[model samples]
Target chain A: MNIDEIERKIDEAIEKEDYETLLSLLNKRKELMEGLPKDKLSEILEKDRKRLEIIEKRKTALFQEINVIREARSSLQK
Target chain B: GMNIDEIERKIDEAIEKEDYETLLSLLNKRKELMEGLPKDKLSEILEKDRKRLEIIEKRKTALFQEINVIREARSSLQK
Candidate 1:
């Protein structure tokens, strides 16, 4: 599949908290080299990978922060 | 200023995503932030939430209508 399919699988991994599957998916992407451009593919891939990293980082940070706030609020209610 | 704007943008994003839990959390945080503010500031925040909610509701209705249209088209094609 293409990058979109790979991205969807990554999202599924996040939702399922399947780290092993995630790693395997990433490795598959590296192996397949699917959706790589003919010209400047390396640069494009680097930029896309960095963009995905940033998105995942932001999502993770938000999830963690929200969890902390929720836990704090729950404790206050206790 | 940047932090406040960032928080507001997050709230908007949550609304767009239809993540009601996140929206509620953001709303509660906003209210908490405004607890010691002046009445005018509190009203401004409340007004913004009201407007945002209105926009969300409007979009939801439009989406429902679009879905209905698609369903009708599909049924017509079947007939």
Candidate 2:
């Protein structure tokens, strides 16, 4: 019923690679956030931006590491 | 001669031990080796890495939201 519950569903969808379900869940989350008071909505949005940045950085690092591993594997094969 | 399984195991152990220095060394070695691979092989590796990052990013976003919600809930209850 709340954002937390909705987020859990979103996570499940992501895990299953269910893009459509994830999209719908995200839309629902957006709708809920829109219905919140302006102050609360702004607060949450700001927090989301900060968290997104950190997530992006971590994701980038992981991809870089994976790339590094692949490179190593190929070198060994050669 | 390159033991991928052994390398992976070492990586896991290093992570478990919080031995970042060892991890970094291993990663650097991997990168250096990859640099000499053919373009097709390199591309494949990059694609897999991209997919892996996508999943990680999604999970990280979920975790961030979970933490924020808990903090907000705690503050409201305190009030």
Candidate 3:
């Protein structure tokens, strides 16, 4: 599959929280990138890095929400 | 070769339990399955992971926004 097309499907699968689909897509991705020139590979890896940074931020926010909820609960008890 | 559905089931279960070790291993297993595919299919996967990352970011932004609203409401209640 084309890289862009594979990626878009991956986005949809993740949004759906369909990890099984995500896993397969991830496998396909690894298979696809295995033999690239180092220069091209690192260029792509940089983009991948940026994308993961975004996801990591999102995960942090999820934890923040839990804390926020706790404060809200505290307010309710006051 | 691993049974696809079995791996999937373990994946689902591990996710619900938040079992990071098992999940990571399973991810590796899945990746191993694709090791011998045509090299032509390679670049697309990184591209896809990139795209999926963008999708997650949007969700993260929304979640942060939600927390802000709740925190604002909590602040007001503290007065």
Model 3: CA > 4 A from native: A8-24, B1-79
Interface RMSD of each: 15.7, 11.1, 19.3
DockQ of 1: 0.02
lDDT of 3 by residue, B3-35 (tens): 545665675575455444465566557566445
- What DockQ does every candidate get? 0.02, 0.04, 0.03
Clashing pairs in 2: A71-B34
Candidate 1: how many backbone clashes?
0
CAPRI band for model 1: incorrect
Residues B1-79 of candidate 1: C-alpha lDDT, one tens digit per residue:
3244566788879767766567666655664466676798667766776677566556555544544433332231221
Docking verdict class for candidate 3? incorrect
Q: What is the fnat score of candidate 3?
A: 0.04
TM-score, every prediction: 0.38, 0.39, 0.38
For each model, chain A TM-score?
Answer: 0.44, 0.60, 0.62
Model 1: chain A TM-score against the true structure: 0.44
Candidate with top DockQ is 2
Show where candidate 1 strays beyond 4 Å. A1-78, B1-6, B13-21, B77-79
Q: Higher DockQ: candidate 2 or 3?
A: 2
Query: How good is model 1 by TM-score?
Result: 0.38
